Amino acid sequence: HTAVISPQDPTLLIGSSLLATCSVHGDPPGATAEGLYWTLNGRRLPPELSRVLNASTLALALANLNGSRQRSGDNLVCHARDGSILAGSCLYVGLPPEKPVNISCWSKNMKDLTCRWTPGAHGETFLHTNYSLKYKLRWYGQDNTCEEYHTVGPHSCHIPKDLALFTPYEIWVEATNRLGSARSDVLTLDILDVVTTDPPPDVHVSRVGGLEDQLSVRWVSPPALKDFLFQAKYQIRYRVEDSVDWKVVDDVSNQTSCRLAGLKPGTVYFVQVRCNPFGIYGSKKAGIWSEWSHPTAASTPRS
Amino acid sequence: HTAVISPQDPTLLIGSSLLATCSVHGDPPGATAEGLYWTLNGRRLPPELSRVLNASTLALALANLNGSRQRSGDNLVCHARDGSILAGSCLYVGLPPEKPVNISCWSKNMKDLTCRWTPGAHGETFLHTNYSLKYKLRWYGQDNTCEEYHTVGPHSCHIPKDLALFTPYEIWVEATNRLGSARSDVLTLDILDVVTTDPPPDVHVSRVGGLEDQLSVRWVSPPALKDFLFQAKYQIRYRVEDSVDWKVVDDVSNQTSCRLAGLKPGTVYFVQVRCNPFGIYGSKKAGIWSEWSHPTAASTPRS
Amino acid sequence: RHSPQEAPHVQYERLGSDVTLPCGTANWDAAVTWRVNGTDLAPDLLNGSQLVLHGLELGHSGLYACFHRDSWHLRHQVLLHVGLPPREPVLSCRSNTYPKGFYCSWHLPTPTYIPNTFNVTVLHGSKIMVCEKDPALKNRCHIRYMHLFSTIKYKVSISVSNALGHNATAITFDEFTIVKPDPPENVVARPVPSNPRRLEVTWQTPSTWPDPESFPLKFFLRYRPLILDQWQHVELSDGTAHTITDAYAGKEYIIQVAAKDNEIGTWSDWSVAAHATPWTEE
Amino acid sequence: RHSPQEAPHVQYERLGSDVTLPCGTANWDAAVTWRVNGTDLAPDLLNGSQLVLHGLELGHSGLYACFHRDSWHLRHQVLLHVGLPPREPVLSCRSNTYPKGFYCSWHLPTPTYIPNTFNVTVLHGSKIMVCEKDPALKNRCHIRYMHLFSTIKYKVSISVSNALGHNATAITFDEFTIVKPDPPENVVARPVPSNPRRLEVTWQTPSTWPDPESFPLKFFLRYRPLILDQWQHVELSDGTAHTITDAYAGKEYIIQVAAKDNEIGTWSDWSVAAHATPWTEE
Amino acid sequence: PGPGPSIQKTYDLTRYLEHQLRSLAGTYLNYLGPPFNEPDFNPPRLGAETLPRATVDLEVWRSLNDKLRLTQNYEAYSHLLCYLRGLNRQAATAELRRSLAHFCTSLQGLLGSIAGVMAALGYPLPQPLPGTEPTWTPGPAHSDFLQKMDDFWLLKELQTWLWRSAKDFNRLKKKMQP
Amino acid sequence: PGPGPSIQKTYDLTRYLEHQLRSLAGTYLNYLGPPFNEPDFNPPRLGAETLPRATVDLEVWRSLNDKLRLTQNYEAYSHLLCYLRGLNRQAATAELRRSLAHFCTSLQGLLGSIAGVMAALGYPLPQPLPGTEPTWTPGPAHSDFLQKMDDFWLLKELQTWLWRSAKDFNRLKKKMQP
Ligand SMILES: *[C@@H]1O[C@H](CO)[C@@H](O[C@@H]2O[C@H](CO)[C@@H](O)[C@H](O)[C@H]2NC(C)=O)[C@H](O)[C@H]1NC(C)=O
Ligand SMILES: *[C@@H]1O[C@H](CO)[C@@H](O[C@@H]2O[C@H](CO)[C@@H](O)[C@H](O)[C@H]2NC(C)=O)[C@H](O)[C@H]1NC(C)=O
Ligand SMILES: *[C@@H]1O[C@H](CO)[C@@H](O[C@@H]2O[C@H](CO)[C@@H](O)[C@H](O)[C@H]2NC(C)=O)[C@H](O)[C@H]1NC(C)=O
Ligand SMILES: *[C@@H]1O[C@H](CO)[C@@H](O[C@@H]2O[C@H](CO)[C@@H](O)[C@H](O)[C@H]2NC(C)=O)[C@H](O)[C@H]1NC(C)=O
Ligand SMILES: *[C@@H]1O[C@H](CO)[C@@H](O[C@@H]2O[C@H](CO)[C@@H](O)[C@H](O)[C@H]2NC(C)=O)[C@H](O)[C@H]1NC(C)=O
Ligand SMILES: *[C@@H]1O[C@H](CO)[C@@H](O[C@@H]2O[C@H](CO)[C@@H](O)[C@H](O)[C@H]2NC(C)=O)[C@H](O)[C@H]1NC(C)=O
Ligand SMILES: *[C@@H]1O[C@H](CO)[C@@H](O[C@@H]2O[C@H](CO)[C@@H](O)[C@H](O)[C@H]2NC(C)=O)[C@H](O)[C@H]1NC(C)=O
Ligand SMILES: *[C@@H]1O[C@H](CO)[C@@H](O[C@@H]2O[C@H](CO)[C@@H](O)[C@H](O)[C@H]2NC(C)=O)[C@H](O)[C@H]1NC(C)=O
Ligand SMILES: *[C@@H]1O[C@H](CO)[C@@H](O[C@@H]2O[C@H](CO)[C@@H](O)[C@H](O)[C@H]2NC(C)=O)[C@H](O)[C@H]1NC(C)=O
Ligand SMILES: *[C@@H]1O[C@H](CO)[C@@H](O[C@@H]2O[C@H](CO)[C@@H](O)[C@H](O)[C@H]2NC(C)=O)[C@H](O)[C@H]1NC(C)=O
Ligand SMILES: *[C@@H]1O[C@H](CO)[C@@H](O[C@@H]2O[C@H](CO)[C@@H](O)[C@H](O)[C@H]2NC(C)=O)[C@H](O)[C@H]1NC(C)=O
Ligand SMILES: *[C@@H]1O[C@H](CO)[C@@H](O[C@@H]2O[C@H](CO)[C@@H](O)[C@H](O)[C@H]2NC(C)=O)[C@H](O)[C@H]1NC(C)=O
Ligand SMILES: *[C@@H]1O[C@H](CO)[C@@H](O[C@@H]2O[C@H](CO)[C@@H](O)[C@H](O)[C@H]2NC(C)=O)[C@H](O)[C@H]1NC(C)=O
Ligand SMILES: *[C@@H]1O[C@H](CO)[C@@H](O[C@@H]2O[C@H](CO)[C@@H](O)[C@H](O)[C@H]2NC(C)=O)[C@H](O)[C@H]1NC(C)=O
Ligand SMILES: *[C@@H]1O[C@H](CO)[C@@H](O)[C@H](O)[C@H]1NC(C)=O
Ligand SMILES: *[C@@H]1O[C@H](CO)[C@@H](O)[C@H](O)[C@H]1NC(C)=O
Ligand SMILES: *[C@@H]1O[C@H](CO)[C@@H](O)[C@H](O)[C@H]1NC(C)=O
Ligand SMILES: *[C@@H]1O[C@H](CO)[C@@H](O)[C@H](O)[C@H]1NC(C)=O
């Protein structure tokens, strides 16, 4: 006492028509020709759409199909008059993937590469879409596939192996699904322009002499920087314990120890220092700024 | 005009004797019979140890050999009268490895296992010794080799894969080198007894009302803990800005917010909170304490 | 209709509706006088030879009698009963005995003034149940179980029949969720002469549980004095004895005991009452 | 010995030692008197017929003459020269011309009072060099190169010969480390009439460098006032011209220029001198 | 230690696995589809008819004495572990696959602990080789709806077997063991 | 960009590789042995006689015009890269092997940049297939002292080739190119 639904697991586009049939097995197929009804995603379809062909076949006509509710596909169940489940099917609908855009990558201490892209199409998110990252050298190299995905979020990959310097790279993203395949545009990227480093650790703020309106902020340069290819540039900011506004200090690129001025005596301040690499032996453009260090509070000795 | 030294790359023990010969190639081998001398690690050996056999062979006798200066082996070079390098050889000496002892492991949030062992023998450090870690279940399992070594220091391994709970493990270390092989004793370890977690983040200290001698310390429990298998126990400590001594507070296991007492008004204090898991649904013994959190400074409003 | 002195007919009507009620097949130009419960009706309500009732309330039901004008000659008697169509019943089942079957009742949220007819049908996947009932109070299937861990969700449906309407309600459940035994019986607490700040509480096992040794229960104890009116919860293991050390020197306590299986079902109701006094030397 | 009027013999003695000096094969019981530089000696110094000198200093060298008692009859003449045994020489070579060979000198740290004999021998791995020298001043091999990037460390050794002792010293180097050209010549600075706080400095290329176009040099400039006595370093690229804007309105400056290859060798010495005055309208 | 701590450890592990299986089944029913997300959803079982059931009578459950119960639990747990390991290819989600791997590791550890408990009581049956036909059970050609039905029935049978094993462990710890 | 930025990039990369090779050679000489750690240590070359040398006359170096120099640099760099990649099996140290892999990647990038510079000037010879006999060069049977001698000579030849390539790039950027 089972039924068969045809076609089994079809593939259509958004807006195309659909024709399915449910044939029950019964020796006196009189009442079964009209007792069967269709159900889509737990919702009973109106009887006006279904049509009867003969005693052992039911017809269904649907049009202007929309996106799938889930990635597994919509469920079309042919139910009996008493509510029994006779047969089932799955519907896969979507749109072909387009070329991804807005691809950006950054390198941390020239030891790893992390890229982030955006699909940019609303038709590919319905079906399961495959995303692969390919990177290679421009003049002499072979295609290499990235393995560690989702290192920072959706649509991202992590390259833990070291990459060659002073050589441009070609990075593109390929999209593949059940419908079609698309490739993104080739992007020429230089590692020396996306250099990112860690914030300077060991932030210590100490008083100097008996001055109540002056302090001293010293730190240690990050050991990850080789100091041979570029020079970092530091920046200091401070705030009041009860105030949310931040006051920024000008470039302190060279001085590892800087003294503030204009501070109010008898007040606790929080100091956060960040560093940014510069361009040496190449493009003089600076790199991406790093995150702020942990806040180190100090008290000014009042008079 | 080359020489040959025999034996080539021998293997001896600490204290054994050594017999090597250097035969030069010359048609009138008269002066070459006594012009050759031995050199070990750039040091000229005394001529009293070397003996002459015939016109085209030199003898050398050594005893009570000691440990190798480098892991590659001592270099024995047969030099000519003018200082030319005729031939060379390498000497490998050491002692067989013993059974390692003092093996301890710890688990972080029941998601990884890190073990640390100690060789304990001074004879195996001279030659290259192989260290492998084997872990398996006691009643039903197979031997598994750890791959990520040196995750925290020398003689250590990291197991990133998840391990089964409520089941003892058998961990042993095997030592293998050019001389022999040894296996450590089987250690029965339970993961529920070496549970280690991260310190509670988001440490915020704020004032309460107008009291100058009381403060409030609140934090957020670590989301890594599932809260179903065990309960953490917090501990708070504080110090004076100008004093190095630390004052510890009693168990604050349940209360996520605790208020200090006895503080001096008009003083900046640094608060560091750490948590320690306990034993639920099993052995009631506590686990390994975690590291202290980042210091959060707060000022007491004076009168 | 038939002869006048026959048994009167019963007619039902909804609340607030409008209906006409004539007595027999008489002509429209006849002299008709109506009476209810023995008193005459005003002529301003008669529509010729028929009687129309506009928006009936509950106080209009009774025996509608139609007599001759200025006489006591009866022609037609009808009993009028006003009711409300039934709503969806409330169905929720519970197994008082885990080894045996379960039982449950059905009742309407709004009571009606007409007796209804009920239907019982249990599916249990694809099968047929009995629901045999010879109880004291009605509305109880008292079905019996046949298997253990059948991995089949039971399905029961309740139907209501009435001359004004009908309804239906069906629910689904399993044998693991609807499990709740009866509270313990004979909860008596006795003091202890040795320790004054200590009380001994003893309870029993409900006789409904057929197998108390194969399926043990996990008891619960709640103790509270009368003046502090604050209950403190404590969970106990298998056993019908407890030793509480939080008793006062000269204060009374109220004890309440519950019942629940080891890991199946929910908690039951507390005990009826309990009173005891601590030990005092004098 | 031979005839008294023959050329005297030369004998060398160390410093502070002891040595006897007899004149001829005469008997021990003969009358012997000695004379130095034309004056007679004291009889308290003669050991029979010989002359002993205890702890000789530098002031005892000269002609030791032995005559007959109370006469001018000569028997034996001998010149005495006191010296010091040689120490290890100081050897350090330098290539003034990179395309051509190199040259170097050898000298003792402590000067001696006896002319020595020197030896030169270069190995260059397993080969034989010439060290042909017809220079103005001595101690200069002036060897010539034969290959480029030979990947063979040169080895030269210096030996010293003397009647009191000998020594030896050998060093090793390569053609990439010992490279230092000569400082520039004709460093002249001229002012500029347009900008008063600006100075123009021009230098030349040393004529020793054979190929200044194939192997370019990287110049260096140093400027400083006379009253400020603080030098500020600035590095220049290929070119024999510079424009400095740190000049004062009425202060003088001293300029010094150096020389060095692009990425081979070390820096050279500065210029001799330079004087200039800024522009002033009056 | 004997049978004292081992039975308690098995009970705690069964409770933890029951909680984790409830969570995983909720997640899988929310991810599967709207029809499988319905509260009741009781269809006739036709897709999965090869996995062992957990339906037993009361007298039959009381007749077995510490050996047939443990053997049936071992074989059913091995079959369920194999099925859940094969079920990994169906789901496509990072966190879902991580939870599946964690539950598979926990179930393997529970099977090992059950084997150790069986071997500790002194029964000369440490591991009687079962099956070896379904030892891998490669996924055959089937429809998507049939696959979802098989997954739902497998999850329900795993929950039922966990409940039955917890009940059996409690009975063994209470009646047959001190 | 043409030959403007490419030659400067190659010069900077050659300088960086020279510094890294100096550091790596110092480390390898400190790790090899006391005799190989001596300041001079000039023995006759007998172990390594197959790798290409970097000895050329002055007139011969001045005769080549932007093609033979680049081809020789490319082939020598490929050979040195293959030898350094094969040299990884000899050293046994985490940080040393990491530095070796970093230097190998940097040398491969420098070879690719040199090939790109050759292809950018418009020379109809992007990559003329050299060798293919030493493309892998598996380590044959040899003694330990001979292996250390080969490693030392390989490091010295790599340093010499780096110096020669830097000089050639400077000459090309100065004389033949504006
Ligand atoms: C009832 O109608 C269905 C649909 O028209 C018939 O099924 C078709 O049968 C023909 C030949 O028998 C096949 O070529 C088609 O492919 C079938 N279509 C489908 C959708 O199944 C069926 O045969 C009819 N039955 C009777 C008794 O007339
Ligand atoms: C797919 O989208 C279409 C377009 O919105 C839906 O069609 C509408 O359906 C509602 C209710 O059934 C009607 O009131 C509208 O008149 C329909 N509009 C059109 C243009 O047809 C359709 O219901 C959607 N289907 C699903 C499964 O979500
Ligand atoms: C890709 O990047 C482009 C460039 O920033 C984005 O285009 C701008 O998007 C912002 C934000 O919506 C708008 O305010 C601007 O008006 C857009 N500019 C132009 C010229 O279109 C674009 O939105 C990005 N796309 C994605 C998918 O992130
Ligand atoms: C010089 O002495 C050496 C060592 O005694 C001789 O070498 C040995 O020769 C014999 C036979 O010729 C071999 O069996 C040994 O194994 C050799 N020993 C070594 C250490 O080489 C050598 O033959 C002698 N030469 C002469 C000319 O007498
Ligand atoms: C190995 O150790 C032994 C023992 O200390 C060393 O032998 C000593 O050598 C020194 C100098 O050669 C002598 O003054 C001692 O008398 C020796 N002692 C003994 C007991 O022999 C030997 O030199 C060491 N060898 C090396 C290569 O380090
Ligand atoms: C292994 O652990 C044991 C136990 O702690 C160590 O033995 C103790 O070591 C300390 C430190 O040297 C001594 O003060 C104690 O006297 C030792 N106790 C005993 C009983 O021996 C042992 O040293 C450790 N071994 C290693 C290699 O770490
Ligand atoms: C009072 O009785 C008269 C007579 O039966 C009713 O008049 C009839 O009304 C119905 C419905 O409006 C019509 O179909 C008939 O044709 C009417 N008959 C005549 C003779 O007019 C009247 O409606 C009744 N009044 C009330 C308030 O019920
Ligand atoms: C006519 O008399 C009957 C009989 O007493 C009344 O019916 C009772 O009404 C009261 C008041 O609503 C109810 O509490 C009783 O339950 C009714 N009894 C029965 C048997 O139904 C009726 O209400 C009276 N009608 C009038 C108009 O007075
Ligand atoms: C069965 O009972 C339900 C519950 O009261 C009825 O649903 C109500 O119907 C009335 C009239 O149509 C509405 O005014 C209410 O809002 C409905 N309530 C709900 C909760 O749906 C239903 O009509 C009854 N069925 C029958 C046949 O009488
Ligand atoms: C309500 O209960 C009645 C009494 O059992 C049911 O009537 C019987 O239904 C069965 C099953 O369809 C038939 O085989 C019998 O012949 C029926 N007997 C009579 C006297 O009618 C009725 O079907 C039930 N209704 C519902 C909706 O469950
Ligand atoms: C002074 O002369 C006498 C005679 O030559 C020296 O006496 C001789 O001394 C040497 C060495 O001491 C002996 O070997 C001789 O046998 C001695 N000869 C006699 C005859 O005694 C004496 O030493 C000289 N004095 C000094 C200070 O040189
Ligand atoms: C004897 O006369 C000679 C000749 O002048 C002296 O030799 C000179 O001594 C001075 C002083 O030390 C030196 O500066 C000269 O260089 C020496 N000249 C030569 C040619 O050597 C000698 O010193 C005198 N001796 C005594 C004892 O008076
Ligand atoms: C070669 O010169 C060296 C350097 O002066 C001499 O070494 C000195 O020798 C003396 C006497 O033996 C010692 O007092 C010094 O301490 C030594 N100095 C050093 C630095 O070693 C060496 O003796 C000379 N060789 C010869 C043969 O004269
Ligand atoms: C010092 O220099 C002399 C002069 O060249 C060397 O004497 C010659 O040495 C070569 C090489 O051994 C011989 O072929 C000649 O026959 C030697 N000539 C003479 C006149 O002796 C001497 O060997 C050098 N000494 C050192 C130590 O280098
Ligand atoms: C996506 O890629 C994975 C591995 O690269 C593969 O197993 C899977 O079948 C791919 N899916 C599609 C739709 O191509
Ligand atoms: C930064 O500049 C100061 C003064 O100009 C100098 O002393 C310091 O060395 C510079 N920093 C670096 C890293 O060279
Ligand atoms: C140590 O182990 C590694 C890999 O397991 C192997 O390559 C090496 O040969 C081993 N060394 C020894 C001395 O066994
Ligand atoms: C800790 O104890 C307090 C009071 O006893 C209670 O309110 C709180 O819920 C406990 N903490 C936890 C995690 O249960």
Residue numbers in the entry:
A (entry chain A), B (entry chain E): 39 to 341
C (entry chain G), D (entry chain C): 24 to 305
E (entry chain H), F (entry chain D): 34 to 211
Which of the paper's sentences describe this entry?
Glycoprotein 130 (gp130) is a signaling receptor shared by interleukin-6 (IL-6) family cytokines (or gp130 family cytokines), including IL-6, ciliary neurotrophic factor (CNTF), cardiotrophin-like cytokine factor 1 (CLCF1), leukemia inhibitory factor (LIF), oncostatin M (OSM), cardiotrophin-1 (CT-1), IL-11, IL-27, IL-35, and IL-39 (1). These cytokines share a canonical four-helix bundle structure in which four major helices (termed helices A to D) are linked by three loops (termed AB, BC, and CD loops), as well as three conserved receptor binding epitopes (termed sites 1 to 3). IL-6 and IL-11 signal through gp130 homodimerization, while other cytokines require another “tall” signaling receptor, such as LIF receptor (LIFR) or IL-27 receptor subunit alpha (IL-27Rα), which forms a heterodimer with gp130 for signal transduction. The extracellular domains (ECDs) of gp130 include an N-terminal immunoglobulin (Ig)–like domain (D1), a cytokine-binding homology region (CHR, D2D3), and three membrane-proximal fibronectin type III domains (FNIII, D4 to D6).
In addition, we have solved a 3.40-Å cryo-EM structure of the CRLF1-CLCF1-CNTFRα complex, which exhibits an unexpected 2:2:2 stoichiometry. The two CNTFRα molecules bind to site 1 of the two CLCF1 ligands without contacting CRLF1, indicating that CNTFRα may not be essential for CLCF1-mediated CRLF1 dimerization. The elbow region of CRLF1 D2D3 engages CLCF1 site 2 mimicking the interactions between gp130 D2D3 and CLCF1. Therefore, the CRLF1-CLCF1 interface has a much larger buried surface area (1480 Å2) than the gp130-CLCF1 interface (944 Å2). Notably, the three gp130 residues crucial for engaging CLCF1, W164, F191, and D215 all have equivalents in CRLF1 at similar locations, i.e., W177, F204, and D228, respectively. Furthermore, the way LIFR D3 captures CLCF1 site 3 is copied by D1 of another CRLF1 molecule, CRLF1′, in the CRLF1-CLCF1-CNTFRα complex. CLCF1 F178 is stacked against CRLF1′ G126′ and is surrounded by N113′, V115′, I123′, and C128′ of CRLF1′, while CLCF1 K181 coordinates with S110′, N113′, and C128′ of CRLF1′ to form hydrogen bonds. The two CRLF1 molecules also directly contact each other at their D3 domains. While R245 of one CRLF1 couples to E279 of another CRLF1 to form hydrogen bonds and salt bridges, H332, A335, and V306 from one molecule pack against the same corresponding residues from another molecule to hold both CRLF1 D3 domains together. Unexpectedly, CLCF1 sites 2 and 3 are engaged by two CRLF1 molecules analogous to how they are engaged by gp130 and LIFR in the CLCF1 signaling complex, supporting the model that CLCF1 has to dissociate from CRLF1 to bind to gp130 and LIFR to form a functional signaling complex.
